[PDB]
Symmetry: C2
Subunit: 409 residues, 2 copies
């Protein structure tokens, strides 16, 4: 009983390898069909199973989940996508509807732990205030119903009421956009830059001076520019804005707060410098860069801020009272600023990676529904989803990229 | 690292095994000191370490956690208690403060994973509209700072703004209260009935007809009354109301929705009966009983509803799409009904047990290195049931020894 080689994004291929079945009842089934009609193969294997649960307003109606899924799970293909779409529970028209809509999460997390051959589950809630066409839902569904979401599993997405505008080209969604990526010389940051450039964006790649030639290498590979910077410095916002003005028209559309450090130590053995330095790089700097780049006009309307939280921030981790406080605080930034940024036309989100390959580890690779570690592209893809200019109805969200890792809160 | 023999509640014993250090800065350290002064040993080990974080309004201020805890952890006693008290992040007076208070949860859960010898952590949030005396905070701090909270670890408790009255005797907190406990013939339900009776309550023990014999025994052993019936039936609310009318002036103070069943099957193989039975017992019935008993005034002002969720309903489990959906549903009832019930002076909360002895892998995969005991789940429920926990509602607390599994 072993790990599937996971399907990942490749130019030119259809989003799903099988057909797309949209079932259930409520307000989303018909407009989603109309929207996905021309790029997806509507009803082969099922590449995708979508259930509209928005019509379920009492716990007695949860039966529809069973009635829809049980006959069709046999036909779900390799790396197939299961998504349940509900109404935001707090916004339901009754306490019965709230209970039912909330119950949907026990279902989708459980079904993630049953699906085979790299297939995944997700739960998406849509505001009851979205218009009937649900154009604000489309970027979320397109990311989920595709190879891009390869390592995102068992999670919950929250879409608001606003309408969206599709990008000129769904395969080039970040075309014309300027994106700043911190910690961009290596690892996940370098890959965010890559996936960003692939989607059409011009990247400002930031890292510390010691990451020298590595930062130039990334910058060259992605067709962007290298900016050598300590993000904790008093003058970081000024220097970032100066580079924007000198090389990118004074604006950025996107900021990815990817740079991060660990200094693991048990609390009983913790020193001031290890606490402070991790707090400075991981929490204080992304807060200062977000408030300062928005505040000086560098990032404005249509803007996107994505932070890197992590599983240790949600579940805790031994020797990481410093790091986990900062990753929990990243979630705080994301939740606290979302209402203010909305008022300025900016979204803010966070991606929380689990076990991702590449510079005990055995357990860490195995302990998830997908039976394997993730790849840096898997995290980059979740982050580009949020960066989309059609993702304006997504804000306040924290999405683990973890293979449905067992560990949590 | 070996598992510790966990200290559990026994009468006449001190709540903590060493002294109680209360530190930090904000609106809570002083009034909390004043409240716990006569019943605790304020400052031989530390039996408890409480840090007031409410003063922290910026991320730069989180260093106070370390400055408080780091020097004193050396002396934290066996089965010791660490609690950080913060201010509800949603209610913060600035986005900086929300961010800093939100961040406290990475801190308490990571520290849960470091603490040795049985000792546990908790985060408590207190509404910024609570009065300076913080009397609504007292039931939660007293549960946490005692042996009763033995298997609760790494969790997050949410206290509102309302004042509270202490019971006449903190050791008999449910004296003169009437409690309905479903699924009470055996197991966790029978133990809830016992702990309730220990705490001075009159228990109305409910279970099914086939359990009539076992239910009678339990009722006699706790000094309560048995009432067998099928909680799914059209007449359940009537039979219970009728029973209350007879024995307890038509009124119950507490309802515990403990009855629940599993019919495990992968969804690909799920049949109608296995889905429907599990939904009916575990979700439909508790809801209908709550709404019914509230609806006819059997549960009124001072009321307490407590539901059994479980870790399955939070994290999911293979072969439990039915049972998980019901247990997430119980969290749904908790959260959805809290606002309207609060207007009637009733709280509603849920406990979500982890691995409880009643196999090798789930026993050990928690910070406490051991499975729980049915008493540990009972205590959590009795904590919410308290007449002094009226400022505690809409909470979901796991009783899992800080099991690694989660969402």
């Amino acid at each position: 009983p072993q790990p599937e080689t996971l399907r990942r994004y490749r130019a030119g291929e259809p989003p799903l390898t099988g057909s797309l079945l949209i079932g259930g009842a409520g307000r989303v089934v018909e407009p989603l069909r109309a929207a996905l009609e021309k790029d997806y193969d509507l009803v082969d294997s099922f590449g995708g199973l979508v259930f509209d649960a928005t019509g379920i307003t009492e716990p007695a109606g949860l039966k529809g989940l069973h009635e829809f899924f049980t006959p069709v799970l046999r036909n779900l293909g390799r790396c197939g996508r299961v998504v349940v779409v509900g109404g935001t529970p707090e916004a339901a028209a009754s306490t019965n509807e709230r209970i039912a809509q909330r119950a949907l999460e026990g279902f989708t997390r459980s079904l993630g732990k049953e699906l085979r051959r790299g297939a995944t589950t997700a739960l998406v809630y849509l505001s009851p205030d979205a218009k009937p066409a649900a154009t604000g839902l489309e970027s979320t569904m397109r990311f989920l119903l595709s190879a891009k979401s390869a390592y995102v599993d068992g999670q919950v997405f929250s879409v608001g009421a606003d309408d969206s505008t599709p990008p000129a080209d769904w395969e080039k969604p970040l075309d014309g956009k300027v994106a700043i990526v911190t910690g961009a010389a290596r690892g996940i940051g370098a890959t965010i830059a890559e996936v960003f450039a692939r989607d059409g964006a011009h990247v400002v790649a930031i890292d510390v001076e010691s990451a020298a030639e590595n930062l130039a290498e990334t910058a060259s590979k992605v067709g962007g520019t290298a900016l050598w910077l300590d993000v904790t410095a008093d003058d970081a916002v000024d220097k970032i804005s100066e580079h924007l003005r000198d090389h990118h028209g004074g604006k950025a559309d996107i900021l990815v707060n990817n740079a991060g450090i660990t200094r693991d130590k048990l609390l009983a053995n913790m020193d001031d410098a290890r606490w402070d330095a991790v707090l400075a790089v991981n929490l204080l700097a992304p807060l200062r860069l977000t408030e300062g780049l928005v505040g000086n006009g560098s990032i404005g309307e249509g803007g996107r801020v994505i932070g890197l939280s992590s599983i240790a921030g949600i579940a805790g981790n031994r020797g990481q009272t410093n790091y986990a406080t900062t990753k929990a605080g990243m979630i705080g930034i994301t939740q606290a600023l979302a209402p203010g940024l909305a008022a300025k036309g900016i979204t803010i989100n966070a991606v929380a990676p689990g076990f991702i390959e590449t510079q005990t580890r055995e357990v860490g690779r195995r302990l998830n529904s997908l039976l394997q570690g993730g790849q840096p592209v898997d995290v980059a893809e979740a982050i580009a989803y949020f960066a989309s200019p059609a993702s304006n109805a997504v804000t306040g969200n924290v999405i683990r990229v973890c293979g449905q890792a067992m560990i949590g809160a």
